[PDB]
Design a protein around this ligand. Sequence first.
Ligand SMILES: *[C@@H]1O[C@H](CO)[C@@H](O[C@@H]2O[C@H](CO)[C@@H](O)[C@H](O)[C@H]2NC(C)=O)[C@H](O)[C@H]1NC(C)=O
Ligand SMILES: *[C@@H]1O[C@H](CO)[C@@H](O[C@@H]2O[C@H](CO)[C@@H](O)[C@H](O)[C@H]2NC(C)=O)[C@H](O)[C@H]1NC(C)=O
Ligand SMILES: *[C@@H]1O[C@H](CO)[C@@H](O[C@@H]2O[C@H](CO)[C@@H](O)[C@H](O)[C@H]2NC(C)=O)[C@H](O)[C@H]1NC(C)=O
Ligand SMILES: *[C@@H]1O[C@H](CO)[C@@H](O[C@@H]2O[C@H](CO)[C@@H](O)[C@H](O)[C@H]2NC(C)=O)[C@H](O)[C@H]1NC(C)=O
Ligand SMILES: *[C@@H]1O[C@H](CO)[C@@H](O[C@@H]2O[C@H](CO)[C@@H](O)[C@H](O)[C@H]2NC(C)=O)[C@H](O)[C@H]1NC(C)=O
Ligand SMILES: *[C@@H]1O[C@H](CO)[C@@H](O[C@@H]2O[C@H](CO)[C@@H](O)[C@H](O)[C@H]2NC(C)=O)[C@H](O)[C@H]1NC(C)=O
Ligand SMILES: *[C@@H]1O[C@H](CO)[C@@H](O)[C@H](O)[C@H]1NC(C)=O
Ligand SMILES: *[C@@H]1O[C@H](CO)[C@@H](O)[C@H](O)[C@H]1NC(C)=O
Ligand SMILES: *[C@@H]1O[C@H](CO)[C@@H](O)[C@H](O)[C@H]1NC(C)=O
Ligand SMILES: [Cl-]
Ligand SMILES: [Cl-]
Ligand SMILES: [Cl-]
Lengths: 608, 608, 608
Amino acid sequence: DIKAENTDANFYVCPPPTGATVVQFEQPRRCPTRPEGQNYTEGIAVVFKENIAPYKFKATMYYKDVTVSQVWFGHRYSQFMGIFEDRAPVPFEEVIDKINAKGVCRSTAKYVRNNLETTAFHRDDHETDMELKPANAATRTSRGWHTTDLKYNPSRVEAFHRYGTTVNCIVEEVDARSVYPYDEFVLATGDFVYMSPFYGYREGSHTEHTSYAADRFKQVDGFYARDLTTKARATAPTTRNLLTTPKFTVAWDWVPKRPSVCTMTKWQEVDEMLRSEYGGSFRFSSDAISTTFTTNLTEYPLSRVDLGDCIGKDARDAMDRIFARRYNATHIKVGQPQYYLANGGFLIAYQPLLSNTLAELYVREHLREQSRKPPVERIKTTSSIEFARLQFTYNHIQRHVNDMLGRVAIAWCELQNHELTLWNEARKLNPNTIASVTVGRRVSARMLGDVMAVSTCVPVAADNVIVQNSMRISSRPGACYSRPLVSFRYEDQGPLVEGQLGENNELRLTRDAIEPCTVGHRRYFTFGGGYVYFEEYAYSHQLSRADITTVSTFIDLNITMLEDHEFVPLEVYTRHEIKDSGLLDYTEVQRRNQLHDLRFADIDTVIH
Amino acid sequence: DIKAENTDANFYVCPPPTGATVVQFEQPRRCPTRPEGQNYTEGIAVVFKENIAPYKFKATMYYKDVTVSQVWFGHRYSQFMGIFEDRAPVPFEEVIDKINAKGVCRSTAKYVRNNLETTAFHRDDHETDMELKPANAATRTSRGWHTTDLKYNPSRVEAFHRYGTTVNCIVEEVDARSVYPYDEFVLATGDFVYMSPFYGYREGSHTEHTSYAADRFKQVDGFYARDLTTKARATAPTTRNLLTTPKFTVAWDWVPKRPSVCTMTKWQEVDEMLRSEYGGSFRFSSDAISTTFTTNLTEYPLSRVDLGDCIGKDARDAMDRIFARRYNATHIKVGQPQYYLANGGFLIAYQPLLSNTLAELYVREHLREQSRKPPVERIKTTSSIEFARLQFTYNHIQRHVNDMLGRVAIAWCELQNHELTLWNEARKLNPNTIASVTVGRRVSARMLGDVMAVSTCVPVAADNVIVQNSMRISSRPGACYSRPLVSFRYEDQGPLVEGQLGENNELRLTRDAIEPCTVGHRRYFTFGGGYVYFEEYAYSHQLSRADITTVSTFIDLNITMLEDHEFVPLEVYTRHEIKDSGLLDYTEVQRRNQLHDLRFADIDTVIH
Amino acid sequence: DIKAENTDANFYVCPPPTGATVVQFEQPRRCPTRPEGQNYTEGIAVVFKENIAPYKFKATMYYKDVTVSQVWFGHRYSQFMGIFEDRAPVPFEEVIDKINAKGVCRSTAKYVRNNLETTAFHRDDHETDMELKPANAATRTSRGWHTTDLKYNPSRVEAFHRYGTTVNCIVEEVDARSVYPYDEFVLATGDFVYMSPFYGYREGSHTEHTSYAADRFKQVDGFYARDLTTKARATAPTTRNLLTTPKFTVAWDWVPKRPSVCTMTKWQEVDEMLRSEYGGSFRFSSDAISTTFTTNLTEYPLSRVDLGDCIGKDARDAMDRIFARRYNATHIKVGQPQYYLANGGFLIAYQPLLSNTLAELYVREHLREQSRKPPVERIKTTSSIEFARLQFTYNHIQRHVNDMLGRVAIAWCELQNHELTLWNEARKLNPNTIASVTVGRRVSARMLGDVMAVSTCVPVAADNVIVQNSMRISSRPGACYSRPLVSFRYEDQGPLVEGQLGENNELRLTRDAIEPCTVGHRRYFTFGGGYVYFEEYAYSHQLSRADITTVSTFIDLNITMLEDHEFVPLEVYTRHEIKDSGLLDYTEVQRRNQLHDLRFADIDTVIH
Ligand SMILES: *[C@@H]1O[C@H](CO)[C@@H](O[C@@H]2O[C@H](CO)[C@@H](O)[C@H](O)[C@H]2NC(C)=O)[C@H](O)[C@H]1NC(C)=O
Ligand SMILES: *[C@@H]1O[C@H](CO)[C@@H](O[C@@H]2O[C@H](CO)[C@@H](O)[C@H](O)[C@H]2NC(C)=O)[C@H](O)[C@H]1NC(C)=O
Ligand SMILES: *[C@@H]1O[C@H](CO)[C@@H](O[C@@H]2O[C@H](CO)[C@@H](O)[C@H](O)[C@H]2NC(C)=O)[C@H](O)[C@H]1NC(C)=O
Ligand SMILES: *[C@@H]1O[C@H](CO)[C@@H](O[C@@H]2O[C@H](CO)[C@@H](O)[C@H](O)[C@H]2NC(C)=O)[C@H](O)[C@H]1NC(C)=O
Ligand SMILES: *[C@@H]1O[C@H](CO)[C@@H](O[C@@H]2O[C@H](CO)[C@@H](O)[C@H](O)[C@H]2NC(C)=O)[C@H](O)[C@H]1NC(C)=O
Ligand SMILES: *[C@@H]1O[C@H](CO)[C@@H](O[C@@H]2O[C@H](CO)[C@@H](O)[C@H](O)[C@H]2NC(C)=O)[C@H](O)[C@H]1NC(C)=O
Ligand SMILES: *[C@@H]1O[C@H](CO)[C@@H](O)[C@H](O)[C@H]1NC(C)=O
Ligand SMILES: *[C@@H]1O[C@H](CO)[C@@H](O)[C@H](O)[C@H]1NC(C)=O
Ligand SMILES: *[C@@H]1O[C@H](CO)[C@@H](O)[C@H](O)[C@H]1NC(C)=O
Ligand SMILES: [Cl-]
Ligand SMILES: [Cl-]
Ligand SMILES: [Cl-]
């Protein structure tokens, strides 16, 4: 008769289970809890870095340009037999009396050179106090004053060597720069001075390093400087230093050391700096600069910092300013400011805050912020902050992803527990399909009260199943079968079995499934890889799944992967671009300069 | 009789609910929608940075080495009483006529020094034009030419001071470098020249800065240079400059200023630069360099840029080249190129594109790209691009994570809405278990049509429950109980209640649960923390959950957390390694050099 | 009679479906698998960078300070007519014999200058061997020795020019520095020396670059140096070099070249460096420094590296040390160390490891690590490692997110497949509501065996529905209706239809829904946007959803988005701060220094 038109499936005989095998459903699981969560402290921060910048100040130089030339005369020319140039230090006396008082300078220089007291005379005449005319126009320089525009040369005497002295008294304002430990400094002209710029008398600054004779240094109390250009006196009374070097004299207003230098520099003021304790370490996170710093749980004492006067003062001046701008009505200062040393060598000044609304915790926390209180050297700061920003970025994504998937993991678990209650009611309705989906294999099931009995199924080949043409019971008219009759064999050569088709291609051995006849009885029955269609209890034809419209119970979820991505090296200016930005390269110049003999002369030839 | 073998659970009496308390299920919720999503513009980009590189050019120096020595003679030695060295500037005349025309130089130097016209004679003889032999072998230098290899010294005259003049005419090619604002420059020898390298006559370049006398400068139109080595003339006619300084004369081919300098440098050409509007700002993202830039919605006018000629020209030359390589058949140029200033001080040249397939929007968008059109100073570029790459990385992960969890949130909601339809049918089947799971507490339920009536349950201690030995009804044989009989008391000292065991350890008060007897009736019934097993309506024994095979209805989901991770500071070369890479340190050298008197002499002793 | 109190809903007439339209549920889907996952190799790494640091060594200088002064006398002063200073190279002879043997130096200098053999006499007397007293106190300098503290000046002779010679024999220890390609070097004093620091005799180091005469260089085998301060000889016998320049003589112990220089520097030792193959490239990831490097699958041969002796030696010395500390009992070395060149110009030395527990794969993998084995130039290393840390951070988050959502996608799919089994049983119970939720529209459904027949519903306006007051059947007492009677019309002007209220506001056309009467029959029935309440089969009143307590079947899931975040540019020290940290700026100084004539004199005036 009729075999299956679709052979791409299996049939199963499903005998009733005895109770030899019994199973139960797993009870609901204890669901994970959301973590308590990191507690953040609100605070104002000031981050500090290593000071790499030198101390800078204003200074004035006083010297003279002593030039002695030697000229020869012939027919009819002249030729310098030599030009001797030297720098003569202007003694304290002339500066205060001739310059700063009148604006004039001497036409004579007198100084110590190579262990002899030499004396020069401008124009080889005698003393004459000469006004200090401003220096010629030159951009990006300080002001300057000279007394003579010209070099003096001897009158012509044929076939003779004559000498001419020139004296130009020079006063220029210069910048001075000193580096740690501030025991010597340099001028804009390139001259070194081997003394601390804080060497004076007032207070204990006479302890500073000097390498010159005591008589080279003098300090004037109440020194009223007079602008050599506007001829104006100074309304302010400044203390003024004067050191006389072998080549010059340097004047500058003296100032105390500590309130003027610092081995630390204020870097970032942070309005909202959240501190969380995490792992026996502190995390100072700033949303505004995307930076997270890591420190120990103990403060760093500023008494361990060499020359760190500016730290306390700068940290307070900012915090007060910020507190008054942002928190002057919303929070409360909890304790004095704190200082922690962060990885990378950053010093963090921190002022814990507490919300007005939660003021009931002040004491509880005030005690805590006092636990961290501190019971000389130099801090070294890295040049790259990128690690602390990697930290910040990573922590933030990490915290978010873990939070969210954590929530999903819980919601997933709750839903599994809840749906068990549906599975429990479903299993009574259709023990076979439920048990099969639960276990993972087509089995036969039957409730034994509260547990579920399970027996295995037996496969039957598709070509071994024949469906009978009719569904009407001839013996007792007025009654028919609900589902079609079938015949089959387990093995290919075996005998036929009288059976009835059940759901899911199950072959039932009892033909008991009986219903009273009806009109227009049209049914589709699952049969093989498709359906068999009956019309009024008579076989019509078979058909395929594709012939019937499909609708889904499934809820779509469209997850795609985040693709691989390659980060290439990328620099704004490469290390070489930075080197080449310098206008002159000392090394390059010296290398050429010192090749000059080799390139253009002969250092390996003696004449006799 | 028989108590519970497992006392680790609860029993509940569940009286029928009246209707005093009624509940309903929450209707389906409005599910969230997926956001519309950022629209990206396809475009070609050229990113620009601050130009930190100086202008560089070729120059030739012309000077002479005037050396006058003084020697003394004894028995039987010689000793230099002095050596006077000077650099004599070669006048325009000799360069064009003797050098560039023949290759020879004069044996005499004549120049201005200390306000006197001096004159030198090589070998103290008279004029003699001397060929310019190439300079000696020296690596990594330019070429050079000198006329004399030797210094001339006077013939021996016992007990006498004699003088000897030496003249070496020198011509070397040198590199020149100038920095913004290009009003002076330096040579490779270290010499400064206080004039703009664009100072000439042609066009309006006579306006450039100079600080020398007019007669120091001359320019030759059509200057045919002659290679002093190969003796070859220049086939090309160049305009040539000549400035005469107090120490030398510098020659170099003159060129216009604007098409030769720029305060900006092309940094990255970007094939695909996506621009999205987001937050009243633009985002220029480049997948290729992993960089996202942030700019305002308005272009930056190039008319605000000082010396930015190269920007327009370079930006176009690249975009055209790229368009022709990649988009010459796929897209359409939309408007002229645009320029936006990005955070960090990056100038972005941008050319919007439009896909051929979507050409119907040209006008619609062409109008938009014209809205941004612009209706002198210096741009400052940071050295660190890392922020814009942090930006890029973060945005990309952010966009992906939000997209995906967004989808989950929707799919989760849809599934909750869908399953309600199962809960609705389940509640009819087992109002007690469904109501209990829904509320959260063991209650008793009953449908009142479309709402659900709920009463509370009553707990009964485990030790207060006894299960009867039989399940057979003695009064009417041929009928038995479905579930075992029980007896219990609410309070420990109270009286016994005739009852029947229901599902989930419920104690039913009516013993109505009756079924017709059967053969082989074996049932497991939930009882306490385990099951009670009956066989043919007679008590067999109790047992524990562990005694029965467990199968799960639950679908596993294995979510683990992304662990904490610490980013340490890491530098390739530390700030100090970069300092020390320099071969000579000017500061270190000067500090030693200027200590020399102090270390090896006496600057504090006068002899008389 | 009674209309709906809540008009905010719809009613539907749901006629039985014929079988004209039939649907089926979508079968379970094939669920995605978890990917196999990247396999990591455990290994020890040593990362190498470009060596930017010069070669540094100790050197001694030997020269003399020859000073000849000229003084004039008057009434009653003195004035230097000139001071000639020169540096005289100390010949090999005096250093070994007078200095290194006794500690004394000559009072005479004899040397070659400007092609003449000059000779100087200290104090203008004759030879006298003078002890070398230590140099004066000066911080941060090396030691030094001079013979004379004073400059000698001639005795006073009125109206006469007299000359005085001074000789100071000087010996100072200096540091020397040379850069690639190491063919010349510099001293701390700033002097250049144009010879390779490896120029000697022993081995083939006579091939090094020199630019001086052969007689300028001498090497002493077995040179026992004597400390000029402690008067102590050297117990060690060193080979010693002596080069004599025109200005000085430099001595230094000679050493071989290759084992002393390198164009590469060890940067990071990495304990655990995981290597994975991914995309025809290798990924070397280090958890400890948060860095992921990218290389080709082929080793880089060290034979392609110029002067890379240190690489092999340093890479082994560390790996052995580390292996012995960490893996001396846990893993096995697999092959000789390997070298790969990574993007950014990093050289990675790698030693693959294998866990003892998985030793069965040695051969299988030993063969593989030999496939990569290599069958001169300079490597260039970027200054920024940030890209490889971006890489690391991104990959790690990427891997985690994809893993987890991947798992969710699978678990989601499995749950959809599992719940179908519930939907299958539910549809028999309530074909109307199930079919409606499945399709998406209120339809009418009926099972046709195994498929489901579906017809559309018809909407009826709310104001068109009237609910009858009673529920009792007058004709046959002892029986009532389960759900209320209703009357309605499809169109507003149409006729009334006798009908019964079903679930979900369906209007049933057959009034068959009949139950036997009961006492206390109180029911709530869905009616419009609320319920209608009956009490003992008689209409009571209507009410709203809000009047009844709501309980939810829904499981909450609380997903929030990860917000936008802006990364601002942030630098620790800006490019300008780094420039200004230098104490002296060569360029700044030279610019001032060379302005001095222009500012303070006149270079444009001839006197006659
Ligand atoms: C505390 O913070 C608030 C923040 O707005 C300040 O409010 C402003 O205060 C200034 C001057 O104090 C007023 O001119 C402004 O009009 C205020 N802003 C408004 C009204 O929006 C407040 O002043 C701060 N308190 C102190 C003492 O500085
Ligand atoms: C926080 O305190 C710890 C103390 O455990 C410091 O650890 C030091 O780490 C360095 C580097 O490895 C070691 O050389 C020291 O010996 C450690 N100190 C001690 C006491 O063991 C750590 O440096 C502190 N953090 C900061 C930022 O200073
Ligand atoms: C536009 O882009 C396409 C991209 O492939 C170019 O195609 C190549 O064109 C060159 C020369 O124009 C041919 O030699 C190649 O064989 C082409 N590549 C192939 C066939 O794969 C195209 O030429 C471009 N158009 C212009 C005008 O440059
Ligand atoms: C985009 O336009 C805004 C205008 O709101 C610019 O904002 C400036 O921000 C700086 C730094 O805080 C302020 O000093 C200026 O006063 C602001 N300008 C104005 C007009 O308020 C912003 O700089 C622009 N973006 C770029 C990259 O230039
Ligand atoms: C191999 O590694 C283990 C790691 O602990 C080493 O164990 C330590 O070894 C040292 C000296 O070898 C002992 O002083 C320590 O007490 C050991 N640590 C303990 C016991 O915790 C082991 O020694 C290593 N092997 C070699 C040969 O170095
Ligand atoms: C890995 O091998 C590839 C070979 O395909 C190298 O690719 C080179 O890439 C540069 C830059 O684009 C090109 O200039 C070369 O022409 C390419 N080489 C070849 C043979 O095509 C790549 O450089 C290698 N990786 C490393 C780190 O060296
Ligand atoms: C899911 O999205 C991917 C790409 O985003 C698309 O290819 C696929 O067709 C989508 N499928 C569904 C069912 O949304
Ligand atoms: C889930 O994964 C974790 C680690 O990935 C493992 O410990 C656990 O046994 C796994 N459980 C299941 C049910 O997959
Ligand atoms: C979910 O969380 C958000 C914020 O985290 C909160 O506003 C909302 O009330 C929460 N809702 C539930 C049902 O958890
Ligand atoms: Cl953080
Ligand atoms: Cl982006
Ligand atoms: Cl990785």
